[PDB]
Design a protein around this ligand. Structure first.
Ligand code: FAD
Ligand code: FAD
Lengths: 446, 445
């Protein structure tokens, strides 16, 4: 019998299981499924934890998610094609819900799917080895409930371990002497810790502007954004300055490429992440910068040096959940034989075509349209329910318009569901005043 | 014949030094490869501002913080082959700051010429034993080149430490607590807690010293809670002693009293686990922190596989001298200088050490035991003997001084067990000595 190892029970791992399960509901015979997850519960990034650095078992803490996090884009842009917001909540909700709400929603689908049973929680994957003699993988894991290390054999391996958890943490001169907190976006947890403080935000990611927004929204004295990249275009609040790149700091102050100086209390490095898989050797290890099209991934999923090994969600994410679904539905169908693979040379070449296309992209719009086209190519091949991608692209377009209008009020906008045509209403509380991030307070009429 | 040494901390340096001191005397040593994940040696002593994961994605190793000073008297760890007098050339006080002790440790290891064996910025991924080969496969990631490579070795000596991977227990409410929660492992700079109420959970040397560090640098209040036995230390006025924590809310802690108090930050000083993600269970040491872990014959030899070794995996009352003793022994086992008893015999010997370990109650007995342990390992090798009883005496002097006044024990002096000279009082009292640099400590300030 065929056995599949699914590494991670985040949205990608949840999608992979949901993919096989939906096919089983259709009457098809599926392979055995084993999903390994180092946390105690599913949700991946979305499973909030107070912990930082290393976890209860000594494993690097996975979630980079913080308190007061709300949907970064329109919820309409991440809605499942097979499990609507209407089906789960039973009513309309605003367009940018808090983390817990989007956690509830993603848990809802897999709970209904009945896939929890395939997952071995509290279990860290240690090593994945491809045996040439038998054409199978040995997957070595550490079960922290039993405190035992074991391995099993698998025919296919789908890696869903994410790529926003191992931080890229560059050093600047003076860091050793600095009297205040220095952390990466990854350790950022509670904006209250920075109340009445001057927080330096180093680098230019999407989290940079959001972490800043949370610190602003919860009473930080001042916010300083410094970055070597192009102006973001966003007009910030009164107590929010921009600077060119950081050069050094001392016991108290930050010094800039500007020639300028300033007192800062905490430094938050929003410098991004690295694709890090310490459980893989180089034959299987994906190595790439964070981008829309990494190489060595046929259809962005199939590992070209070993087409029995797969990666979900390893691309940078304009689209998220339904990309993972599209990806997992494709991976399923390749595993199940429903879609035979071309030659390695043919795969390599198809991948190069997607790569050259990527290098020609010069606008935000070209980028998510590109990824939207990649998703279209994926769902065309399988029985994943198709949805209006071009209309998703317009919703994204609207979202970037709303960001440019006012960077602090973009979450007060509402959008039309592309799955059901349901119009999201204005939330009861405007973002800047919605200090309570609970699912209970959000779904309330109060 | 090849040896892999995992870690370039004091234990890995001890193991490298052992082989270089067989060579220096006139022997034919095996090939040495020392893998180190940091960019430099020192282990705990290589201080970093970093927390959680390092620049490469590896767990930050060091648990050491700004303004850290020698835990005990420097006399108790003085190297026989390399005295404090030789290194510095002048007399110094008995509790030097990290930087000064680091200059000292660095000193001896540089004059040993062993750096050439160490591949830095290299993290050990996996170690496997091949029955058919009777040799170990050590897979590694080299972060300078981003390359993962396997190499074969005849013996492995694991020196990856056990004070870096935290035991981090959760309390009810932690999720909603509005202040910082960090482990002792993440503690870096006491300045961050100026004018703040800090809760310290758990009992250890570091709990005491982290609190002291916060107190010295201007914390508004400190609160110590634990389940273990109190020492009855005479704490300051703004230092509070409470029974175990039960709960926290947005800003308040709740104790077994039923009493509550607002706290700005919580520092979990709850110890560490022996964590070896590079090993399978065939090789992997499983133990709580104690004087006598099992499956370690003479505390060093892995009993299920005699060709695999652990250094410094015991709880540390003695430190550097223990590693040296353990390193010397392991070297002589590796070099065929000492034959091993059968698995049945090794386990008998280890059982007796464990029975004696469970009888130990007092500080005095703990030192004696580990003292006696090191003596046993020293007698089997060409390692120079030292005055263990006098070291214990000096250790006990220090614990008595802690009990007199926890805030002043570092101002006391002790007699060098190498020169017999009484160390001079330091130019600045500890509570006023805010500058922790080597330069400030060595000058006439
Ligand atoms: C700060 C932040 C904010 C974000 N906000 C949004 C947003 O607002 N909207 C949006 O659409 N997307 C957002 N994202 C993007 C996010 O990546 C996706 O929403 C989604 O979480 C990706 O799912 P994933 O399963 O592919 O990866 P992850 O969510 O990271 O899941 C990886 C899983 O694998 C597990 N794992 C990793 N290593 C091992 C191991 N060795 N052994 C066992 N298990 C392992 C982890 O525990 C985890 O469960 C955000 C990301 C970050 C970092
Ligand atoms: C906070 C603190 C304060 C202390 N103060 C004192 C003191 O004042 N006096 C005293 O005598 N002792 C003190 N100690 C005891 C201390 O453990 C020893 O001094 C000494 O550092 C132990 O050395 P070690 O080499 O066995 O382990 P470590 O010093 O912990 O070093 C282990 C080395 O292995 C490396 N490593 C681990 N895993 C890997 C991997 N997978 N791949 C590659 N490399 C790896 C690490 O980088 C590290 O360098 C203190 C300990 C702590 C935690």
């Amino acid at each position: 019998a065929t056995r599949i190892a699914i590494l991670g029970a985040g949205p990608s791992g949840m999608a992979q299981l949901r993919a096989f399960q939906s096919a089983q509901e259709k009457g098809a015979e599926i392979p055995e499924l084993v999903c390994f997850e180092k946390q105690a519960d599913w949700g991946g990034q979305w499973n909030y934890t107070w912990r930082t650095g290393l976890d209860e078992n000594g494993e690097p803490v996975h979630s980079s998610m913080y308190r007061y996090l709300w949907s970064n884009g329109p919820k309409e842009c991440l809605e499942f094609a097979d499990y609507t917001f209407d089906e789960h909540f039973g009513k309309p909700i605003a367009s940018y819900p808090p983390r817990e709400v989007l956690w509830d929603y993603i848990k809802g689908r897999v709970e209904k799917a009945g896939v929890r049973k395939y997952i071995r929680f509290n279990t860290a994957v240690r090593h994945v080895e491809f045996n040439e003699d038998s054409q199978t993988f040995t997957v070595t894991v550490q079960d922290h409930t039993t405190d035992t290390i074991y391995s099993e054999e698998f025919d296919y391996v789908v890696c869903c371990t994410g790529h926003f958890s191992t931080p890229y943490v560059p050093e600047f001169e003076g860091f050793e002497k600095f009297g205040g907190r220095i952390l990466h976006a990854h350790d950022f947890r509670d904006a209250l810790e920075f109340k009445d403080k001057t927080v330096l935000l180093v680098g230019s990611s999407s989290s940079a502007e959001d972490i800043g927004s949370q610190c602003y929204k919860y009473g930080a004295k001042k916010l300083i954004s410094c970055y070597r990249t192009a102006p973001m275009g966003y007009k910030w609040p009164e107590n929010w300055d921009e600077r060119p790149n950081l050069v050094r700091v001392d016991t108290e102050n930050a010094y800039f490429a500007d020639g300028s100086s300033e007192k800062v209390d905490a430094i938050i490095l929003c410098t991004g992440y690295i694709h890090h898989f310490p459980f893989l050797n180089d034959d299987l290890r994906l190595v790439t910068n964070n981008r829309l099209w990494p190489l060595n991934l046929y259809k962005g999923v199939v590992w070209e040096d070993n087409p029995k090994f797969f990666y979900i969600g390893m691309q940078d994410q304009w689209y998220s959940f339904n990309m993972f679904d599209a990806q997992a539905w494709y991976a399923r169908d390749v595993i199940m034989g429903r879609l035979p693979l071309p030659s390695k040379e043919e795969m390599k070449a198809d991948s190069m075509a997607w790569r050259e296309k990527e290098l020609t992209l010069v606008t935000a719009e070209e980028m998510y349209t590109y990824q939207g086209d990649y998703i279209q190519n994926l769902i065309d091949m399988t029985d994943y329910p198709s949805f209006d991608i071009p209309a998703t692209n317009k919703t994204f377009l609207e979202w970037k318009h709303h960001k440019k209008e006012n960077i602090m009020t973009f979450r007060d906008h509402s959008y039309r569901s592309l799955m059901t045509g349901t119009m999201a209403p204005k939330h009861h509380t405007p973002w800047i005043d919605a200090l309570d991030d609970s699912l209970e307070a959000y779904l309330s009429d109060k």
